[PDB]
């Protein structure tokens, strides 16, 4: 069953999304989002985008670390809930996992499912291309074309980031 490797990684992806979207406590939500980011970078690395996966992994690890510092600082409780300390959190986690595995079982039986779009049941390895790409990877040249072509995108993004820095300075002032 090694041909469904991306499908298994996506199953772990939705599992982690169910794990942190039930909102037990932001520490374990951060752990679930770290796991989800890892399997997501694995998925996009399996599709060939190694640079994009490594970049999103690094960015979300840094963001989740700053988040963890914030929740240790500010959003804390005397008795944090791991997953089973609250009935509603454990309940919604259980139904999320149950719905995910029900969808897995249904798509693994007749190889077809209808949830609002229509989806197949075969592994994604069919939709790959059969030819080679020469002496370059397409994603690397595509992101490297940001400076040679996307001047407007670079300008508006740099202005947005500078304005964001100014906004962060202005909001947390107090007077």
């Amino acid at each position: 069953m090694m041909t469904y490797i991306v499908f298994i990684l996506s199953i772990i992806f939705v599992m982690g999304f169910v794990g942190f979207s039930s909102k037990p406590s932001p520490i374990y939500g951060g752990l679930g989002l770290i796991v989800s980011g890892g399997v997501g970078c694995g998925i996009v690395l399996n599709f060939g985008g190694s640079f994009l996966g490594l970049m999103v992994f690094l960015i979300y690890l840094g963001g989740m670390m700053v988040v963890f510092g914030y929740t240790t600082a500010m959003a804390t409780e005397q008795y944090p809930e791991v997953w089973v300390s609250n009935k509603v959190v454990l309940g919604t986690f259980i139904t999320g996992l149950l719905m995910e595995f029900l969808m897995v079982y249904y798509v693994l039986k007749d190889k077809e499912v209808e949830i609002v779009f229509k989806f197949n049941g075969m592994g994604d390895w069919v939709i790959y291309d059969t030819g080679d790409s020469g002496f370059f990877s397409e994603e690397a040249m595509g992101i490297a074309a940001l400076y040679s072509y996307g001047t407007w995108l670079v300008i508006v993004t740099g202005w947005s980031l500078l304005i964001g820095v100014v906004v962060i300075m202005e909001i947390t002032r107090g007077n």
Partner: protein, 98 residues
């Protein structure tokens, strides 16, 4: 379509129904926002890498940048809240009901 598309869309819907029902904590909603952003990023780069649209590879990473352009902003909208009240509960944000 395929299968991983279905799984990523299911993850997006899971994070959406996680976001829309708050649990008296702002950081959890911010984590849900980051999760939906991650799911959108993964779906976009999956479609782009499948369809060999190379010139759109500038799209997702640039997209990821604007994630912080709200996400860090959300943290800056929390500290004043955590200076107004001792905690960050969303039930304390009910002064604008009159």
């Amino acid at each position: 379509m395929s299968l991983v598309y279905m799984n990523i869309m299911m993850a997006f819907t899971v994070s959406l129904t996680g976001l829309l029902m708050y649990r008296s904590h702002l950081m959890s909603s911010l984590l849900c926002l980051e999760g939906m952003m991650l799911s959108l990023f993964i779906l976009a780069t999956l479609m782009i890498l499948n369809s060999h649209f190379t010139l759109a590879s500038m799209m997702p990473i640039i997209l990821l940048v604007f994630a912080a352009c709200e996400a860090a902003l959300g943290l800056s909208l929390l500290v004043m809240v955590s200076n107004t009240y001792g905690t960050d509960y969303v039930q304390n944000l009910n002064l604008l009901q009159c």
